[PDB]
Design a protein around this motif. Structure first.
Motif, PDB file in Angstrom:
ATOM      1  N   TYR A   1       1.502  -0.787  -0.365  1.00 35.03           N
ATOM      2  CA  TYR A   1       0.126   0.236  -0.258  1.00 35.03           C
ATOM      3  C   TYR A   1       0.765   0.918   0.053  1.00 35.03           C
ATOM      4  CZ  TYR A   1      -3.452   3.442   1.600  1.00 35.03           C
ATOM      5  OH  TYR A   1      -3.917   4.321   1.645  1.00 35.03           O
ATOM      6  N   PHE A   2       0.468   2.228  -1.404  1.00 36.38           N
ATOM      7  CA  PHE A   2       1.242   3.512  -1.251  1.00 36.38           C
ATOM      8  C   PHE A   2       1.021   4.229  -1.341  1.00 36.38           C
ATOM      9  CE2 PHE A   2       4.956  -0.362  -2.358  1.00 36.38           C
ATOM     10  CZ  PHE A   2       5.306  -0.041  -1.859  1.00 36.38           C
ATOM     11  N   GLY A   3      -0.267   4.601  -0.655  1.00 39.39           N
ATOM     12  CA  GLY A   3      -1.219   5.880  -0.770  1.00 39.39           C
ATOM     13  C   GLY A   3      -2.050   5.945  -1.939  1.00 39.39           C
ATOM     14  N   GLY A   4      -2.195   4.573  -2.413  1.00 42.21           N
ATOM     15  CA  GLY A   4      -3.675   4.261  -3.366  1.00 42.21           C
ATOM     16  C   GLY A   4      -2.718   4.426  -5.097  1.00 42.21           C
ATOM     17  N   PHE A   5      -1.172   4.330  -4.949  1.00 42.71           N
ATOM     18  CA  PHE A   5      -0.659   4.341  -6.497  1.00 42.71           C
ATOM     19  C   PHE A   5      -0.186   2.868  -6.583  1.00 42.71           C
ATOM     20  CE2 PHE A   5       0.117   7.946  -7.536  1.00 42.71           C
ATOM     21  CZ  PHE A   5       0.445   9.116  -5.907  1.00 42.71           C
ATOM     22  N   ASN A   6      -0.910   2.469  -7.470  1.00 42.09           N
ATOM     23  CA  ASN A   6      -0.565   0.547  -8.140  1.00 42.09           C
ATOM     24  C   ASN A   6       0.459   0.681  -8.215  1.00 42.09           C
ATOM     25  OD1 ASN A   6      -1.458  -1.876  -7.294  1.00 42.09           O
ATOM     26  ND2 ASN A   6      -3.449  -1.131  -9.062  1.00 42.09           N
ATOM     27  N   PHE A   7       1.919  -0.368  -7.856  1.00 42.41           N
ATOM     28  CA  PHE A   7       3.204  -0.703  -8.422  1.00 42.41           C
ATOM     29  C   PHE A   7       3.474  -1.739  -8.648  1.00 42.41           C
ATOM     30  CE2 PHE A   7       4.105   3.390  -6.101  1.00 42.41           C
ATOM     31  CZ  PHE A   7       4.770   4.012  -7.225  1.00 42.41           C
ATOM     32  N   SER A   8       2.437  -2.737  -8.382  1.00 40.09           N
ATOM     33  CA  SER A   8       2.102  -4.475  -8.930  1.00 40.09           C
ATOM     34  C   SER A   8       2.410  -4.621 -10.424  1.00 40.09           C
ATOM     35  CB  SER A   8       0.721  -4.626  -8.533  1.00 40.09           C
ATOM     36  OG  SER A   8       0.801  -6.174  -9.026  1.00 40.09           O
ATOM     37  N   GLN A   9       3.037  -3.443 -11.212  1.00 42.91           N
ATOM     38  CA  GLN A   9       3.157  -3.919 -12.691  1.00 42.91           C
ATOM     39  C   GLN A   9       4.856  -4.127 -12.515  1.00 42.91           C
ATOM     40  OE1 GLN A   9       0.578  -2.680 -16.006  1.00 42.91           O
ATOM     41  NE2 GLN A   9      -0.707  -2.135 -14.676  1.00 42.91           N
ATOM     42  N   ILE A  10       5.275  -3.062 -11.956  1.00 38.83           N
ATOM     43  CA  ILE A  10       6.951  -2.358 -11.673  1.00 38.83           C
ATOM     44  C   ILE A  10       7.462  -3.276 -10.814  1.00 38.83           C
ATOM     45  CG2 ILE A  10       7.171  -0.501 -13.627  1.00 38.83           C
ATOM     46  CD1 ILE A  10       6.715   0.934 -11.234  1.00 38.83           C
ATOM     47  N   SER A  15       6.726 -15.803  -8.159  1.00 36.21           N
ATOM     48  CA  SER A  15       6.211 -16.847  -9.347  1.00 36.21           C
ATOM     49  C   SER A  15       6.455 -17.360 -10.121  1.00 36.21           C
ATOM     50  CB  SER A  15       4.672 -15.786 -10.162  1.00 36.21           C
ATOM     51  OG  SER A  15       5.142 -15.109 -11.082  1.00 36.21           O
ATOM     52  N   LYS A  16       7.562 -16.264 -10.826  1.00 41.20           N
ATOM     53  CA  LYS A  16       8.637 -16.843 -12.168  1.00 41.20           C
ATOM     54  C   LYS A  16       9.948 -16.455 -11.664  1.00 41.20           C
ATOM     55  CE  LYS A  16       8.683 -14.333 -15.340  1.00 41.20           C
ATOM     56  NZ  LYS A  16      10.554 -14.137 -15.344  1.00 41.20           N
ATOM     57  N   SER A  21       9.404  -8.483 -14.274  1.00 38.47           N
ATOM     58  CA  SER A  21       8.061  -7.329 -13.426  1.00 38.47           C
ATOM     59  C   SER A  21       7.695  -7.571 -14.239  1.00 38.47           C
ATOM     60  CB  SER A  21       8.263  -6.029 -13.462  1.00 38.47           C
ATOM     61  OG  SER A  21      10.073  -5.500 -12.249  1.00 38.47           O
ATOM     62  N   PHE A  22       6.420  -7.227 -15.026  1.00 43.68           N
ATOM     63  CA  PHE A  22       5.291  -7.438 -15.868  1.00 43.68           C
ATOM     64  C   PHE A  22       5.695  -6.489 -17.377  1.00 43.68           C
ATOM     65  CE2 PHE A  22       1.075  -7.439 -18.738  1.00 43.68           C
ATOM     66  CZ  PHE A  22       0.910  -8.182 -18.369  1.00 43.68           C
ATOM     67  N   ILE A  23       6.446  -5.183 -16.913  1.00 45.10           N
ATOM     68  CA  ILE A  23       6.881  -4.503 -17.887  1.00 45.10           C
ATOM     69  C   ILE A  23       7.777  -4.349 -18.579  1.00 45.10           C
ATOM     70  CG2 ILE A  23       7.081  -2.207 -18.960  1.00 45.10           C
ATOM     71  CD1 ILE A  23       5.241  -1.519 -16.794  1.00 45.10           C
ATOM     72  N   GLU A  24       8.631  -4.960 -17.798  1.00 40.24           N
ATOM     73  CA  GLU A  24      10.248  -6.237 -18.002  1.00 40.24           C
ATOM     74  C   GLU A  24      10.178  -7.366 -18.559  1.00 40.24           C
ATOM     75  OE1 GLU A  24      13.941  -6.062 -15.728  1.00 40.24           O
ATOM     76  OE2 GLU A  24      12.590  -5.148 -14.590  1.00 40.24           O
ATOM     77  N   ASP A  25       8.664  -7.801 -18.688  1.00 36.67           N
ATOM     78  CA  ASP A  25       9.007  -9.302 -19.217  1.00 36.67           C
ATOM     79  C   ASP A  25       8.447  -8.884 -20.555  1.00 36.67           C
ATOM     80  OD1 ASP A  25       9.754 -11.595 -18.040  1.00 36.67           O
ATOM     81  OD2 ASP A  25       7.296 -12.039 -17.326  1.00 36.67           O
ATOM     82  N   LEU A  26       7.888  -8.294 -21.412  1.00 37.34           N
ATOM     83  CA  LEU A  26       7.298  -7.889 -21.715  1.00 37.34           C
ATOM     84  C   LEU A  26       8.601  -6.675 -22.817  1.00 37.34           C
ATOM     85  CD1 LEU A  26       4.024  -5.666 -21.744  1.00 37.34           C
ATOM     86  CD2 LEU A  26       4.355  -7.783 -22.362  1.00 37.34           C
ATOM     87  N   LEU A  27       9.781  -5.948 -22.347  1.00 37.77           N
ATOM     88  CA  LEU A  27      10.041  -5.210 -23.097  1.00 37.77           C
ATOM     89  C   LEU A  27      11.087  -6.526 -23.286  1.00 37.77           C
ATOM     90  CD1 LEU A  27      11.062  -2.390 -20.468  1.00 37.77           C
ATOM     91  CD2 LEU A  27      10.283  -2.244 -23.014  1.00 37.77           C
ATOM     92  N   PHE A  28      11.637  -7.555 -22.630  1.00 32.63           N
ATOM     93  CA  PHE A  28      12.208  -8.813 -23.195  1.00 32.63           C
ATOM     94  C   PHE A  28      11.552  -9.561 -24.152  1.00 32.63           C
ATOM     95  CE2 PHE A  28      16.125  -9.564 -20.497  1.00 32.63           C
ATOM     96  CZ  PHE A  28      16.149  -8.717 -19.492  1.00 32.63           C
TER      97      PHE A  28
END
Ligand code: NAG
Lengths: 49, 39
Positions: A1-10, A15-16, A21-28
């Protein structure tokens, strides 16, 4: 929890096995690499097919 | 990055002394002094 900011993607996820991250997976996945001598490809070069 | 003959692997981690390859370094350490390879 970071004041409502969603940092779940970076932020990384455990799991893997490669902790990226998710965006790092897309860039790779977006860049098609042409190998870097990691698996020692002379053994596959000996087996010419 | 190939294979190493003459340096024993250890299950520790220090700063890099001699850069070998993909995350492997080598050093001259006392752990009778010898040459060890680590991550
Ligand atoms: C936004 O945050 C909620 C909980 O904080 C999470 O369940 C959700 O997956 C997040 N959004 C994205 C797109 O990941």
């Amino acid at each position: 929890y970071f004041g409502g900011f969603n940092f779940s993607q970076i932020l990384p996820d455990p799991s893997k096995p490669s902790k990226r991250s998710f965006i790092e997976d897309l860039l790779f996945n977006k860049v098609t690499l042409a190998d870097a001598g990691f698996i020692k490809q002379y053994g596959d070069c000996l087996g010419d097919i | 990055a190939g294979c190493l003959i003459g340096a024993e692997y250890v299950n520790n981690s220090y700063e890099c002394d001699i850069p070998i390859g993909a995350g492997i370094c080598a050093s001259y350490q006392t752990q009778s002094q010898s040459i060890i390879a680590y991550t």
